[PDB]
């Protein structure tokens, strides 16, 4: 049972919601595209290893109100994701794989 995040409120404010998710080692997590596009979900190697952070990242440009991404949360650890454009605009989210 994957967690589901949305890249922006299903209204019109760019917030990652849920901004922090906790799910199990080996499960996956989905993201839903909404509004204020483009967004991407770009994981900084935020304590976790480069390769895992990379493979979990999505530099895919999400234009279609319908496109959704999935990441495999194998390695227990912290992954911290942001948007490339909105990186430092307060648009960030966090993952705790258990
Ligand atoms: Cu964004």
Swiss-Prot record:
Domain of life assignment: Bacteria
Localization, per the record, is:
Cellular thylakoid membrane
Per the database entry, which stretches of residues form a coiled coil? Answer: none
Q: Name one GO cellular component term.
A: plasma membrane-derived thylakoid membrane
Q: Which parts of the sequence belong to the Plastocyanin-like domain? A: 1-98
User: Where does this protein chiefly localize?
Assistant: membrane
One annotated GO molecular function is: electron transfer activity
For this chain, the annotated S-S bridges are: none
Binding residues for Cu cation, per the UniProt record? 39, 83, 86, 91
Record membrane topology: Peripheral membrane protein
Q: Which cofactor does it need?
A: Cu(2+)
Swiss-Prot/TrEMBL induction comment: By copper.
| Keyword Membrane found | yes
- Keywords assigned by UniProt, alphabetized: Copper, Electron transport, Membrane, Metal-binding, Signal, Thylakoid, Transport
Of which family is this protein a member?
A: Belongs to the plastocyanin family.
Function description: Participates in electron transfer between P700 and the cytochrome b6-f complex in photosystem I.
| Name under which the protein is recorded | Plastocyanin
Organism, by scientific name, is Synechocystis sp. (strain ATCC 27184 / PCC 6803 / Kazusa)
Q: What is the lineage of its organism?
A: Bacteria, Bacillati, Cyanobacteriota, Cyanophyceae, Synechococcales
């Amino acid at each position: 049972a994957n967690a589901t995040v949305k890249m922006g409120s299903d209204s019109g404010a760019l917030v990652f919601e849920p901004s922090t998710v906790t799910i199990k080692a080996g499960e996956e997590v989905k993201w839903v595209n909404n509004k204020l596009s483009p967004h991407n979900i770009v994981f900084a190697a935020d304590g976790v290893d480069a390769d895992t952070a990379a493979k979990l990242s999505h530099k895919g440009l999400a234009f279609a109100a319908g496109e959704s991404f999935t990441s495999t949360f194998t390695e227990p650890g912290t992954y911290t994701y942001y948007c490339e454009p909105h990186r430092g605009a307060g648009m960030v989210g966090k993952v705790v794989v258990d």
